[PDB]
C-alpha cells in the first residue's frame, strides 16, 4: 500500500512540474481498482490543504487542484460495497463455519490472519486489528507474530502514523524474540529509524539504517528503491567525513544502489566533491538532491531546510580544518556564491556554537578558530561539574 502513498505524496507540494503529479496519478488510478484506497483516498484532501486539499465531492464540495482524478465518482461508490461483500462477507461466512464445526486451532488462527489482509485491501484498520486480536492468543511461532506486525507496519506508511506504530513493534519483539533473517530484523530496525525522521532525532534515526542491508524489500510495506534512498541519503547527513570514506563512498551495496537507479545523485556527486575538495560544483548538486530526491520522498519532507543548511555548515568546516586561514576571493567568489550571501550563511552558524572561526572585512581573511590546549578539559570539564551536581542532589534532597 506504500506504492499508493509514495506516488500520491507528489500531490502535496510540487514546485517544479505538474506532470510529476500526473505521472504519479496513474499509479493511484490503477491500484484503487484492485484495492480500495478510500481511507487514504479521502485522507488526500484531509491531510494538506491549499494545494490539492480543496477538491472533494463527498465531505466538502469545492474544486481546487492540479489533478482532477482525486474526485469521487459513481464507480468507486459501487465498488466500495462490492469489495466489502466479496473480500469480507463471502470469506467471513466460510470462517464462521470453521468456528462452529471446531476444525483445528492454528488453522483457524491463520484464517483470521489471511482474512485480515483483505481488510487492508478495503482499507479498514479497525477490523484488521480485531481479526488479528483473536489469532493473537493462538500465535506461537513467528509465522503469526510477524503478520500482526505487518498490519501495524501498514499504519505508519498507509495511514501516516508515527506514534502508535513504533510502540507496538517494541512489544512484539519483547514477546517472542528470534529475528529470523535480516529482513525480519530490519522491520524492527530500519522502520524504527523511519519513525525517528518525523521527530528529528538526528543520528538516532541513522543508527540502524547504516547497518541495514540494501537487499531489504517489503513490497506493500516498502519497495527496493525506497529503502535505498532512506539508507543512502540519511547516512550522508549523519556520518561525518571520517565515516564517509570507509562506508558511504566505498560500499559493496550502496554503490550498487545509485548505479542501478541514477535518480539518486547523492552518495556520488556529493561525496566526490567533498573528497576532491572542489566546492565550486558541489553547490548545484544540493539542488538536484533537494528537489529531485528529498522533496518527492515522503519521510524526507519532514526536515525540509534542515538538510541542505546542515551541509552548508559542514562544507566550510572541512575547509577550515585544512587551513589556518582563508581568502575572501576564493570563498565568496570562486565558489559561485556572493559576498552578501556568504555572510548570511556563516552569520548564523557561529552564534549557534556549532563551529568557531574568524571573519574579516578590510583584509577579507577567514581565519579558523582552534581549541589548541582547551579541547574537552576547558568547557566540557567545567560543564561536567554542574552537570552531575544537580542530578546528584536531586534524589538526595528529598531523603525518603
Amino acid at each position: 500500500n506504500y506504492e499508493v502513498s509514495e506516488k500520491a505524496f507528489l500531490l502535496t507540494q510540487s514546485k517544479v512540474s505538474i506532470e510529476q503529479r500526473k505521472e504519479a496519478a496513474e499509479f493511484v488510478l490503477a491500484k484503487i481498482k484492485e484495492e480500495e484506497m478510500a481511507p487514504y483516498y479521502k485522507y488526500l484532501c484531509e491531510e494538506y490543504l491549499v494545494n490539492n486539499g480543496q477538491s472533494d465531492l463527498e465531505h466538502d464540495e469545492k474544486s481546487d487542484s492540479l489533478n482532477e482524478w482525486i474526485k469521487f465518482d459513481q464507480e468507486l461508490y459501487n465498488e466500495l460495497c462490492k469489495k466489502n461483500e466479496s473480500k469480507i462477507k463471502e470469506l467471513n461466512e466460510k470462517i464462521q463455519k470453521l468456528e462452529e464445526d471446531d476444525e483445528g486451532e492454528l488453522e483457524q488462527a491463520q484464517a483470521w490472519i489471511n482474512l485480515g489482509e483483505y481488510y487492508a485491501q478495503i482499507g479498514d484498520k479497525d477490523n484488521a486489528e480485531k481479526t488479528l486480536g483473536k489469532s493473537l492468543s493462538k500465535a506461537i511461532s513467528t509465522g503469526a507474530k510477524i503478520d500482526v506486525m505487518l498490519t501495524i507496519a501498514r499504519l505508519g506508511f498507509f495511514y501516516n502514523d508515527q506514534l502508535y506504530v513504533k510502540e507496538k513493534l517494541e512489544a512484539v519483539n519483547s514477546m517472542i524474540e528470534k529475528g529470523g533473517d535480516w529482513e525480519r530484523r530490519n522491520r524492527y530496525k530500519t522502520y524504527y529509524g523511519i519513525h525517528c525522521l518525523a521527530v528529528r532525532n538526528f543520528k538516532e534515526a541513522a543508527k540502524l539504517l547504516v547497518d541495514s542491508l540494501a537487499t531489504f524489500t517489503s513490497i506493500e510495506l516498502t519497495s527496493y528503491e525506497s529503502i535505498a534512498t532512506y539508507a543512502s541519503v540519511t547516512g550522508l547527513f549523519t556520518l561525518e567525513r571520517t565515516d564517509l570514506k570507509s562506508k558511504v563512498i566505498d560500499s559493496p551495496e550502496l554503490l550498487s544502489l545509485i548505479s542501478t537507479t541514477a535518480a539518486l545523485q547523492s552518495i556520488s556527486s556529493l561525496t566526490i566533491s567533498l573528497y576532491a575538495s572542489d566546492y565550486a560544483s558541489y553547490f548545484p548538486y544540493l539542488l538536484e538532491t533537494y528537489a529531485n530526491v528529498l522533496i518527492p520522498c515522503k519521510y524526507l519532507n519532514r526536515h525540509a531546510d534542515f538538510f541542505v543548511r546542515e551541509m552548508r555548515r559542514k562544507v566550510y568546516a572541512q575547509l577550515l580544518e585544512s587551513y589556518k586561514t582563508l581568502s575572501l576571493k576564493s570563498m565568496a567568489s570562486a565558489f559561485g556564491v556572493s559576498v552578501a550571501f556568504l555572510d548570511n550563511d556563516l552569520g548564523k552558524f557561529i552564534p549557534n556554537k556549532q563551529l568557531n572561526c574568524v571573519i574579516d572585512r578590510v583584509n577579507g581573511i577567514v581565519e579558523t578558530n582552534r581549541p589548541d590546549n582547551k579541547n574537552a578539559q576547558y568547557h566540557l570539564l567545567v560543564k561536567q561539574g554542574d552537570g552531575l551536581l544537580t542530578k546528584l542532589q536531586k534524589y538526595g534532597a528529598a531523603v525518603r
Binding site: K15, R200, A280, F283, P284, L287, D305, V308, R309, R312, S333, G336, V337, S338, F341, N344, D345, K348, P351, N352
Partner: peptide
C-alpha cells in the same frame, strides 16, 4: 535547542541560490 527548530530562517530556499548559477559565468 537554541535558535534551531521553530524560528528557522525564512530564506536560503530557492530565489537566493538560484541566482548563484548566473554568477559563475559573470566572472
Amino acid at each position: 535547542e537554541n535558535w534551531d527548530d521553530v524560528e528557522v530562517d525564512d530564506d536560503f530556499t530557492n530565489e537566493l541560490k538560484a541566482e548563484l548559477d548566473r554568477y559563475k559565468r559573470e566572472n
